Design brief:
Plasmalemma vesicle-associated protein (chain A); membrane protein; mainly alpha; homodimer
Amino acid sequence: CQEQLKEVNKTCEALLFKLGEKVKTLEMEVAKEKAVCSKDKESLLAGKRQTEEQLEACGKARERQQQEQQVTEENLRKVQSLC
Amino acid sequence: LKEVNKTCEALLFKLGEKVKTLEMEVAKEKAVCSKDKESLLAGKRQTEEQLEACGKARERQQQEQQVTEENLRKVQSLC
C-alpha cells in the first residue's frame, strides 16, 4: 500500500516537473524578449529625437541665411539707385 | 496520500493553462515589438531624409549668398 501510492505519485510528479521546465523556459524567453525590445525601442526613440533636434537646428540656420540674403538683396536695390 | 496525487493532477491542469498563456504572450510580444520598431525606423528614416534635404538647401543658399554678395561688391566698386 505504501509502495503503490509512492509509485503512482512518482509518475505524476515527474510529468509535473517535465512541464514545469517548459513554464520556466517560457518565462525566461518572455523576460529576455521584453528587455531586448524595450532597450531597442528606447534607443530608436532617442535616435529619432536627436535627428529631430538636428533638423530643427538646420531649419534655424536656413532662416538666418535667408535673413542675410534679404539684407544683401536690399543693399543692391538701394545702391543701384545711386549708380 | 491520495491527497498529494490529487494536488499533483490539479496542478497539471493549471500548468497547461499557464503554458498556453505564456506561448500566446511570446507570440504577441514578438509581433508587437516587430511592428513598433518598423514604425520607429520609418519615423527615423523620414526625419533623416528631411535633415538631408535641409542640408542640401542650406548649401544651395550659401552659394546664392556668394553670388549676390559679389554682385553687391561689383555694383558698389563700379558705382
